[PDB]
Design a protein around this ligand. Sequence first.
Ligand SMILES: Nc1ncnc2c1ncn2[C@@H]1O[C@H](COP(=O)(O)OP(=O)(O)OP(O)(O)=S)[C@@H](O)[C@H]1O
Ligand SMILES: Nc1ncnc2c1ncn2[C@@H]1O[C@H](COP(=O)(O)OP(=O)(O)OP(O)(O)=S)[C@@H](O)[C@H]1O
Ligand SMILES: Nc1ncnc2c1ncn2[C@@H]1O[C@H](COP(=O)(O)OP(=O)(O)OP(O)(O)=S)[C@@H](O)[C@H]1O
Ligand SMILES: [Mg+2]
Ligand SMILES: [Mg+2]
Ligand SMILES: [Mg+2]
Lengths: 213, 438, 119, 133, 493
Amino acid sequence: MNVTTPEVAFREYQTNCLASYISADPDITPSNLILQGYSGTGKTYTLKKYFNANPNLHAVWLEPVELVSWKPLLQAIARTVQYKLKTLYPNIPTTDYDPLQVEEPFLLVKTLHNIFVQYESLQEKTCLFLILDGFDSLQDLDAALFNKYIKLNELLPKDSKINIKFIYTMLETSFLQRYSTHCIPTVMFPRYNVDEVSTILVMSRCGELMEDS
Amino acid sequence: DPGFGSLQRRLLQQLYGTLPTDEKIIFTYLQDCQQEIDRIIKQSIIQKESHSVILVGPRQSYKTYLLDYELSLLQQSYKEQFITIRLNGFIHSEQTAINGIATQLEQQLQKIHTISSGSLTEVFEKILLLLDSSITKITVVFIFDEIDTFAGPVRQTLLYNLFDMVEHSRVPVCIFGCTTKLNILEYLEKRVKSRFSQRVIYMPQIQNLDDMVDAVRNLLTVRSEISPWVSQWNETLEKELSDPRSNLNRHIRMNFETFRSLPTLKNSIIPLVATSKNFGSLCTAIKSCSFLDIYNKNQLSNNLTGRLQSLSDLELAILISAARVALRAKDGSFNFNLAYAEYEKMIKAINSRINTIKLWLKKDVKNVWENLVQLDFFTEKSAVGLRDNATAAFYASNYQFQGTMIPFDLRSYQMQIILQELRRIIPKSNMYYSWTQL
Amino acid sequence: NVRMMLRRSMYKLYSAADAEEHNNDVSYDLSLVENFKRLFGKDLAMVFNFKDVDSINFNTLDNFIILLKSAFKYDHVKISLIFNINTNLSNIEKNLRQSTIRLLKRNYHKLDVSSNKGF
Amino acid sequence: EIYELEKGKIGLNYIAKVFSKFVNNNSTRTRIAKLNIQQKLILCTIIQSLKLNSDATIDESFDHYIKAITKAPLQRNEFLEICTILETCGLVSIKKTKCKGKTKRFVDKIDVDLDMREFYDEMTKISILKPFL
Amino acid sequence: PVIRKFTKKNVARAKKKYTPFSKRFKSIAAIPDLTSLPEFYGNSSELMASRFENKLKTTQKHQIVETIFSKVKKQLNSSYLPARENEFASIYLSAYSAIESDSATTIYVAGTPGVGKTLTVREVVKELLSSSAQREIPDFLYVEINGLKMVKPTDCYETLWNKVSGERLTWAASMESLEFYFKRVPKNKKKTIVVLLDELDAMVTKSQDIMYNFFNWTTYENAKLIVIAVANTMDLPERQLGNKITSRIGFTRIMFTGYTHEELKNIIDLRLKGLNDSFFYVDTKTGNAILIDVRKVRLRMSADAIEIASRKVASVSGDARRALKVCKRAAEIAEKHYMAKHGYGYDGVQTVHITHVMKALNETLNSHVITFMTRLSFTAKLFIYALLNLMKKNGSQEQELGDIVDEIKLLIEVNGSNKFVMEIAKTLFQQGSDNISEQLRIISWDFVLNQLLDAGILFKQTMKNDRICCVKLNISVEEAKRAMNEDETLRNL
Ligand SMILES: Nc1ncnc2c1ncn2[C@@H]1O[C@H](COP(=O)(O)OP(=O)(O)OP(O)(O)=S)[C@@H](O)[C@H]1O
Ligand SMILES: Nc1ncnc2c1ncn2[C@@H]1O[C@H](COP(=O)(O)OP(=O)(O)OP(O)(O)=S)[C@@H](O)[C@H]1O
Ligand SMILES: Nc1ncnc2c1ncn2[C@@H]1O[C@H](COP(=O)(O)OP(=O)(O)OP(O)(O)=S)[C@@H](O)[C@H]1O
Ligand SMILES: [Mg+2]
Ligand SMILES: [Mg+2]
Ligand SMILES: [Mg+2]
């Protein structure tokens, strides 16, 4: 690959095992990727540091804690994928589809298919990284919603130029031990150390204390 | 150098399965079951016969893999002679399955050269006059994924209509049902069983350890000569697989007794091949397997032992006291008052024998108590977790439970980790280790 | 529960934003708070007002406060919370969770509103 | 209408036909249709799977099976397909019910309809269905 | 303008009229003759189904290759008969004595699935259409109402009134229209109609009003309909319909009993009369058989194979479809043997015999759970062994998970002598390496919970506490006992 591993200070395994799973070629990239951790364990920081260290590949940042049930989640996916593609390849005729038309998972499949088959005018096949930061932080959550996002690349077309690659972010480890037989690449984030907390706080806070008037 | 990246990209493409469909590998333990699928599906795109089979096998047992291999193998020549209708049993409820078939009959017959429009009755009749009704027709291959949800114990209308256009139709159909239940024929209503061809073919599992090392040999060897290093990389692979005392064969041997699955090995091997930077580094990294114990340690880094290891001292005393109180009760329930009436008793007995432990007041043990329910060390009394379907997670979202209206320090919690399992995992050099006995 | 609070809150927000202006349909969640700056052109300053704070579930209320806390990153909002308590403050910060209490200890003010105080 | 099928003596066999058709035979045709002993003693297994448990799972009808004959193998498929004969005749009900128990997911049940008076006289000829009662 | 509380952007409404047949003319004395009307009874624009026909035909190309067994696999598809005579005669007489007498009868057939009831009913209607073409009777418009071919159980009104009248209304307007047309319109202006109610026990929904109306329009003197409703259980109006509607359905109740082995042998004999013992001119180069290099080949679909396929399927449920499925699987097995032995590939005599049809008779009598739990992992067999030996101690079938965990730990700690278990008990708890502490659960514990939960062997109740979550064996205990006795290590451990 040609990705740039970031210099995250105390997640050294995770950035190496994150550049081994996020690439610009859609063949050498998994279709689902879990980043299970706990509160404060550095998931979003190392994700943003990785995606800022690699400006070429395309991210979709979506947080299902401010989108309570599953229907605003589908509507927000179908909204922001189209909004990301509008500002990525501007010179393609992009007929705006309404994200509120999505009411079911099937209509998300149909809407995303009609969005993707209008970008065939490109040159080479790319992947778009849709990040669901906090999938267990969904408020009105059930045990069978995650099966509807695993088996979504089974429905998007195979010889297409834009392929959706998900990156989840879990937090609970009894949620993830239900989807264990699906064999999704799981990158676990263990809880920080006192010797590491004591200097994470120093590198984070001692800039805004001398600059505190 | 640009010589090593070709070998690495080819290796990761073989490990994902994203090869072109002429060097795409088929493992030897699933070469007989690929012959049966090839026989079934090759007398419906060519001979235009119609039938229905159900593929039973566990998750990640290569059912969608085999079926997509056939449908990409029956497309290099007979492209225009078939269309595919794929639908899940998760994202297609039994009312949204009709719109799925109508949207996928419309857009697939468009690409060869309005049935999607109308209400549900008009759409369901527009796709019953199309399928139930020298020249060659077009066949439809239905791919039902997780068919054990359409076979629910109420009506089974979609299965009756789909299996009914097998005998009684003029259009050749071939419908594949991938499921996971071994008792799938007990699910079907007795007039959908009579329409069914009864040809359920079970996927093969791994019977021998030789099958697993032959599968890894098939996955990691390179056939097409792209990089200069391949003439070494094959042989340095076989030196690890022929010798039954190396590290790679030992990890395959412990994979054969644990989860007996090739995709777990694939997710082990992929960040080994992808984090390496030079060919000699990759060679010694697969010689030693210096990553299949780094990764395998991280996969257990927080379940109930790698995050109890990261507990603090007051939190550990609170957890030990709570497990003592639950061990002392009858059915295993306690609360914050019964837990703090053991923390101060234990710590007063610590200061009795002797420099000490600061007793934190009950205004600060509340934060510790909340931090041990956000790590799942306590559950409530009978609180079920995530509900099974989406409606039962709605029916309870409108219910106001009694365990959340009572005050905080009277909620009758329950242990996740008993005191015997707490005894053996805390190190014996602890100042509370004697307090885990009872 | 939390979703009816969110739908009613964003419904009242979109109503009292599109009727105080003198046209599409959005979903009633915090995405409207995200793109309120580009939907209307004005900065948001919503002031919440919980009527019988002693009568709501605090388990639903701190979930709503957590769900509101993620609105901080949008640079044009200003959330203000107003709690109408008919009891003492040692019965609200006993029932809430401690992280929400430490979030509420950032710019809090008290105000005794009772016609027996100060005759 | 049955008079016209020959091309009060014949206006009686219809009721003597539709009464006997719905009735069939409680014990005379019971073993007659069963003719097979393996289609006979299993009905006694369901009779013994009622005065211990009311949630008579086909497993419980088959755990009773290898608590009676344990004295060519037999799999569960033979038992659950020979039960279809007792389904086809119109005695037994196998469908999915609530399955109360501890967990509330669906499973097969067994139930019988006729009162145990004439069936208890039906066993008076078979010398092997007398110890199983 | 307005701000809406929710949206229904994906809504699709039909084009269906609301005012019924009662308000066309509002004159009962001046209703026109409905029979020879241009739109009624399918007299105009009956190409309304054959619009989609030239979509599933592509290229007439590439010379498809039949084989010697492709003929039998085509003649064993969906298509006098010596099977149903005493039912065909009674049904055709009971439906002919109403066609000739302008009556309003109702015939009730029932049977377990496969006994040919819909075949004999459709042949009765074909023969009555032949009698109408011979003009010994008046004519009728034939309507088939399938109980499961409709998304709403009240769409029976819509499709019946559409088939009668050429106009499509909503279901309420259609039921009022059919009520008026079957009550008030006199018997000189309506030709009769016969209604097949296919799979009746799927329109009993929430009111029994559809079951009321279709059996209460036939109690009228002024309605010339004949309902030939089929069913799936003989005592259906005694179980799930009211006793008044039982009195409506009446006393006919002709049962289609199961087939016999002689009848089934005659059925397969008539299906293969044109192909058995005949001669085919195959070619050595491909295999393309042609019935009357080139080899004249017989085809002996042997009568002993036919009768040994027929006796078992005559015992179990007696279905003339499952007999065809058995005898088609036998021909499929023969064709696979033939093609693999000759290298033919798609673009002496041939036989089908007893030890060749026994594979087609054994393909549906295999429980592939024993051969699944043998090939299961060692930890999954150890899970099942811990669950199996907890049962003799407890007697509940519903053991907890904290008990299974401690029983697994008990077995591993109490067997410290066996070389196999001391080799495996290191990896079972620490994945064979240090820098990994001794885990509380064994490795692959959630994996072997889920691999049996999805497979239906295991049965866990939903709760948040994975120490008191109960777990049941959903299959059996006897087959788990007979599957745990072939391990060579769990037989002693
Ligand atoms: N390795 C690190 N180096 C520097 N700063 C860090 C590091 N880890 C954490 N931080 C800081 O601590 C914060 C932790 O927040 P996050 O990284 O978002 O953790 P988190 O798991 O996303 O929290 P959740 O899951 O959203 S509740 C970061 O925003 C940084 O400010
Ligand atoms: N179309 C495909 N192309 C390439 N690799 C695939 C494809 N489908 C599956 N795989 C890979 O094959 C392995 C398992 O295959 P699967 O087909 O997903 O197993 P499975 O039988 O589909 O599981 P199910 O559908 O839940 S029963 C994984 O490594 C997948 O990434
Ligand atoms: N005597 C027979 N002759 C020819 N085919 C028969 C005969 N009996 C049954 N069949 C087969 O059964 C099919 C007719 O369906 P039936 O079995 O009569 O309908 P049914 O009995 O109502 O089954 P269900 O439960 O409604 S799906 C035909 O396609 C035949 O192949
Ligand atoms: Mg985050
Ligand atoms: Mg699948
Ligand atoms: Mg039928």
